[PDB]
Point group: D2
Chain length 260, copies 4
């Protein structure tokens, strides 16, 4: 997998999965624009890449805003000459049962996860469709693109929706040499998780080990957290694939949680 001469935009990439994707794509030779609401956050990642010998810039962008997305993607295209790869990535999670789920929270969840994917896609296609130069568009989904959990109606709905948009893009983008994919990570261990574990142990009245192995990773086959590296490697594989053979497909990266 080599991306020398390629240009990539990764959104929500100041941290976590999106940051590791950015790092991995740059390592592979891609020139990478790290887009995030926080320009300083984006810059820190870009600075890490440049220090390691790669090529990156940080781009401030509210992905729910058409104007900010269009301008920012065009800025990338101007700096780098193209946009070969778009990775649309958001991780914001707001939980609540449906009967208590705020409509404001609901709308913000759809806007960030899905409108952000729609807008950045639309903006990237303006450049990818030019003379059918082509491109790869990857949405970061979840096992929750495929399977539900209680208290996560907004997130599960959004992640399900991302599959539909990607599948339409695969049929529309083919004649312009644009491929689409969805990558669906399982449970990643975070500082938040580290705090949620003892909480749920006390509330449920079981051990923290049972919270990890049975509550959180009970649907995995091995009781192992998914790593950002797992995810980034799969994105790299897709980004560098030599044909459109995998277009429209989703890839579940979850240690056996939901098997398709």
């Amino acid at each position: 997998s080599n991306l020398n001469g390629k240009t990539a935009v990764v959104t929500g990439a100041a941290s976590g999965i999106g940051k590791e994707i950015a790092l991995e794509l740059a390592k592979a030779g891609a020139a990478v624009a790290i887009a995030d609401l926080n320009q300083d956050g984006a810059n820190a990642v870009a600075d890490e890449i440049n220090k390691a010998g790669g090529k990156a810039i940080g781009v401030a962008m509210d992905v729910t805003n058409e104007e900010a997305v269009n301008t920012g993607i065009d800025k990338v295209a101007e700096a780098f000459g193209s946009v070969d790869i778009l990775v649309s990535n958001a991780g914001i999670q707001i939980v609540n049962p449906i009967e208590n789920y705020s409509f404001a929270d609901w709308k913000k969840m759809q806007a960030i996860h899905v409108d952000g994917a729609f807008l950045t896609t639309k903006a990237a296609l303006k450049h990818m469709y030019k003379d059918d130069r082509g491109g790869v568009v990857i949405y970061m989904g979840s096992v929750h693109s495929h399977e539900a959990s209680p208290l996560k109606s907004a997130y599960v709905t959004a992640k399900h929706g991302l599959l539909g948009l990607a599948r339409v893009l695969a049929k529309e983008g083919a004649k312009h040499n644009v491929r689409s994919h969805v990558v669906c990570p399982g449970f990643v261990r975070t500082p938040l998780v580290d705090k949620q574990i003892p909480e749920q142990a006390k509330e449920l009245g079981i051990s923290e080990e049972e919270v990890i192995k049975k509550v959180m990773l009970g649907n995995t086959v091995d009781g192992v957290f998914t790593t950002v590296q797992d995810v980034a490697q799969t994105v790299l594989f897709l980004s560098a694939f030599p044909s459109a053979a995998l277009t429209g497909q989703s890839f579940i990266v979850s240690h056996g949680w939901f098997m398709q």
Copy 2:
């Protein structure tokens, strides 16, 4: 069973098409049926039809994109009929364009009507269904495009896919309250619009069998009756055995 005597149902987007047939069929099976639609006259007409035919119905004006309007409208159903046992969340708006020309305004309108309308009406219905764990059935009207894409329909396909996710979460949250969830996914229905599209688009019979219904096994349009009978079956099912499932009513277009 499928008998719904003493049951109460609300069907959104029900002034015409699939929604109206579902409303007629539920009423025929004994249910008190509230016809919710953006257009009050359209809703009343269906309710009049049901009443004149010996059923029991009301019309309700409802903008399903508007929280207040949904809450008030659903509350009127409970006020009139005593409860809300069945919610059928139905919308058919279709705006087509390739993604690069898809207007953000059209995008947001599509998601608001199809998905936010499902979320708002569900939230409102659960207030009544969850009381004393009385229970209920919530049915979302999806599409084969809940499962498969077609070009030029990014907004619709994205919304219909999202409906599955909402339904599957509801299935998990609602069980403790005796609320079931389902999605009914019709294939290609021969609507008055399609009727116009057939001569305009090889002869018409080729347009139908090859162009429009080429992914079916038999070249037969899905009927509003096929859909309504499936909705009726789910509405009257004696246990939560089918909760969380989607039901593809498409003559073999997408088999799972």
Copy 3:
């Protein structure tokens, strides 16, 4: 309603198959109960006839081509037609793959899958005639869609049934033959009634809710009635709209 219709249900001396037979008979179908055990078959047929239905028992080794063909032809000769075939088996043999006997493997595939293939083949001889048509239903499992450890033979066979059904939906269409797969979740058998208290040691409520039904939304066993009503619904559906589809009847264990 299934008046003047004829059904064959295999593996039907007990359990799910037997309830399916009873229910189809109740609906007005003439039912042939096929089973390796002719006495067991007869018992179900006797119970139907006593209730005012019409039924016969037929001995049949569904893994044997000659026995299946002869048996189906005999049903068709006696009743005048074969309108509905329900292919049903429940044999379960568990072992980890590395210790899974090849003999056990072949017997599992023969009963579950070869049985479906052979009975289907023999029934199509009659359904294709004059394009009379028919409905073919395979009894799968949630294990048609999702795996469990120690059940490689069963899961493989039940996954395979989906493939066969989906081919039959495409081929059968021109002859008015529909196919479906019904996929039950965990059913409470006398065997399960015995396993619950022992696994409780090897809470009862915990064994039921967490160990056996932890993947359901409500911790409720699927009933044979749940299953039978779904088969009835498909058998009597007024078009081919549901052909090729599977129906998960599991209380939310695997949602599609």
Copy 4:
């Protein structure tokens, strides 16, 4: 990733086609490769091809329907190379007929080669992979027909569907022993058989784009390289993150 230096692989059905190309790619990546096939001469030829290009390979005669032959053959891999790290179970035999004319003999041969062969080689490989929980990767070669049906292919579609079930069970059992499982599902590959059918079946261009690849998004044949690159990526993956999953390599024919 994707380097396999010091790894050992066995590929069945590998004298030609997808199997051969997979074998070539694994060896290029540094794996020691055993070419297993019914024809010893065919297996040797691929082995000689690998060895001359700088790789390391042996030929193994194996009838995958035969438990003794499989056990012996897999043992020969371990004996020559010290281990068995990767198993790729591959078979492409296709026999077409409509179900009512599908020979039971052909049916049983299809299932024995595609599915029993996967079961037998898997079971033989686990004896080595489970030793001290050394671990390994088992990849079954499926098809889009693991997921979707075509007419006249009941036996193939059934087999390929069933392979999913076996892999998913293996994913669950194998994890504690560090064994991963996957299924790679190729779409329409342009074989010499295909090469002959295109001019036979109005324009050649029309036959390719509409008749054969009408369900792709781009009208492009899947290549043996597309398939082999995917197998390689799975074979070298640094964790069990992708275990139990299937990978559809089909240019948009069936999207999930």
